[PDB]
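G., before I forget:
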Amino acid sequence: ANKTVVVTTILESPYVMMKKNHEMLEGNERYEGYCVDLAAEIAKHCGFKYKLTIVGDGKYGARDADTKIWNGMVGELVYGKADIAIAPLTITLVREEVIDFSKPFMSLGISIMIKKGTPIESAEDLSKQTEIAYGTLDSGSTKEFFRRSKIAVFDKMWTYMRSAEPSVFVRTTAEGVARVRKSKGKYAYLLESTMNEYIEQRKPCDTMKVGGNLDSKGYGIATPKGSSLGTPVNLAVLKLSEQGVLDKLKNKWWYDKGECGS
Amino acid sequence: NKTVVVTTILESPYVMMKKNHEMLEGNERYEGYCVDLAAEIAKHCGFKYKLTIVGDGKYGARDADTKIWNGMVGELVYGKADIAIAPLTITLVREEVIDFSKPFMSLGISIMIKKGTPIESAEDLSKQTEIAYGTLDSGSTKEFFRRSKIAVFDKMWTYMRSAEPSVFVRTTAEGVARVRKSKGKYAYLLESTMNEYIEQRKPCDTMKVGGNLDSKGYGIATPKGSSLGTPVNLAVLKLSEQGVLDKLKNKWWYDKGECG
Ligand SMILES: CC(C)S(=O)(=O)NC[C@H](C)c1ccc(-c2ccc([C@@H](C)CNS(=O)(=O)C(C)C)cc2)cc1
Ligand SMILES: N[C@@H](Cn1cc(F)c(=O)[nH]c1=O)C(=O)O
Ligand SMILES: N[C@@H](Cn1cc(F)c(=O)[nH]c1=O)C(=O)O
């Protein structure tokens, strides 16, 4: 019979955030954001009840080279702890081999965040100098993009980042933002364009996205391989796209209440 | 195994007839982004294939009366082709009847005008009557307008469906020619990918205006449940991650730009 769907997700703004009065709230009511709204829409169109659960290790999902064990949200799906992931989870080949993904609900590419006034306009620019350090989220699809790239500029960037001291990798997007804001232009952060565009709209309005994106991809709703939820969830994503709901939700969480002007 | 029958469509710069194609044979008759993409997918999946241009020259729509699918979608649904490798938009009604890979290219509906036309947006088009406008007479753009509940787009559809003479065209080439020859009195609604290609082609007399009206993707399609779906999708993800899709886009779009 019908069972409550366990949703794995991650505290990443503005996708899932603690509500102001979270300390006296319980269950799903503790959270707000794009993916909270998206989970409600998907659940409504698919006819299920659900419980939002923040991934224990705070990771997206990577496979350890030695143990072959998956961590993060991907791990929660692979090992049967969650029924679905509704999060800014990038569709990647290695993940697609072990979990199912809907068609993407949001587009993005790796991008560059600078402190305003930093003399950098492109990845090439970063790669041709050493005064400004740069890095990525310490686990996830961005780091993997650099590790795997055969493109010379990106390989050069990876060769620098992997050996940089102190480490240029950060544990959370928030840590990356802090490092940009505090480093007087001497750190630049490589992060997904969606997060970058969100942060550019937040006080104190001291960061900006520069240059084109380094790649082009999408976030997808993920389920364990072969789950019966996969098909209706995908149809729901396509419906929400075609109805304009995904556009409305992006505007709601990114731009409608932006803090850095119009 | 056997030779995979690929349905596709003549649409620049995805599939085009080569110069001197009349003395060429088979796959060698054709060139373009989807020709290259088909070669890459087939190499990764280890199959031989035959490119075939869809008989009716359509993308795929379901007749409201007979419920029969035409175009490339129809070729898959009725067992005439094994796979479609083309700028085929992923849509809900199609996803219900065929399988799609993850998308290989992003696009949105967009506006093409003859340069100097006093139009900057869909809202602009919707608020006037001097300039006619239309879409490809079958496909996802037409369906977008037919189904939209957004006020500006519904207003546009209400005009287009009843316009006389017809504002709909059989091919993109026909829509572009109509823009070019109508002295600013016809604007064309078409996918941003095609728009951006045409904008950089002689005679350089058209431009894209405004933002895109939606955001979606093209996918590789197979008959529902086909065993080809899984390896083809993995191939699309590999080509994406390797930077090959970007290389192919750069090759077929901005490399052949003729307008500076
Ligand atoms: C891993 C890659 C193969 S990928 O990310 O899946 N695709 C790569 C390719 C360059 C690309 C990248 C991004 C997009 C893209 C386009 C639209 C969207 C959303 C708004 C809608 N997705 S959809 O499938 O078209 C829709 C009908 C629901 C999300 C992603 C489309 C194509
Ligand atoms: N979406 C990524 C995780 N992720 C998140 C970010 F904000 C970022 O900048 N880079 C990144 O890899 C994934 O799914 O691994
Ligand atoms: N990709 C569409 C077909 N298609 C092509 C175009 F060039 C266009 O402008 N509009 C459109 O619907 C589909 O798959 O129906």
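Residues 3-108+218-257 of chain A form a domain with the D-Maltodextrin-Binding Protein; domain 2 fold (CATH 3.40.190.10). Chain A is about 35% helix and 20% strand.

More on Monday.
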